Design a protein around this ligand. Sequence first.
Ligand SMILES: O=c1ccn([C@@H]2O[C@H](COP(=O)(O)O)[C@@H](O)[C@H]2O)c(=O)[nH]1
Ligand SMILES: [Mn+2]
Ligand SMILES: [Mn+2]
Length: 199
Amino acid sequence: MAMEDFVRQCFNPMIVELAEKAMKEYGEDPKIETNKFAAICTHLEVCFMYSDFHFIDERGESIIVESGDPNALLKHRFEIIEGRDRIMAWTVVNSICNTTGVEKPKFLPDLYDYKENRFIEIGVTRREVHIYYLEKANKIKSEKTHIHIFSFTGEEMATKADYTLDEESRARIKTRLFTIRQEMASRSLWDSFRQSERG
Ligand SMILES: O=c1ccn([C@@H]2O[C@H](COP(=O)(O)O)[C@@H](O)[C@H]2O)c(=O)[nH]1
Ligand SMILES: [Mn+2]
Ligand SMILES: [Mn+2]
């Protein structure tokens, strides 16, 4: 099994399509840069998972709701920036900055947290979490964007040791990353995937 085939069996086809469109906009070829493609799929899925089930009620409070209720039509606690094309990503960042008064980032982050009122940059790494954290922090002299890094081995590091989410939501993400690593190993793709990451 090539990595390209694994990606299509491992990830939901909507994620694969959003990831493919992002790669093309980002200028890379999914059929060549197969480890990048897997990484983008993984990161995007992690961005979706971070946001799942978290909402702001009509009383302005952050609550959790796992039942996919047909009447549950509340404002999401997070807005997702990743997966949108640049035009639409800036449209959303602009709206957020208007609606909330928060400082506009110079780089597109991945998420906005309506409770904490801050952008979030997500990192998913096969390397060491601390070094990836520093790389991100360096790359975005912003200082107002919260950084949250996950590794496939279950480590995490976030700005000021503030992990934003409850432990169970993070464990949900960590379980999906455990699974991806486990399944890659079984098809002998993990070693390649892990060494392929670069700064
Ligand atoms: O121009 C870009 C931006 C992002 N990415 C990839 O998209 C994923 C998410 O990026 P980030 O939101 O953590 O920057 C990473 O796998 C990163 O390498 C690219 O390949 N090119
Ligand atoms: Mn991003
Ligand atoms: Mn990110």
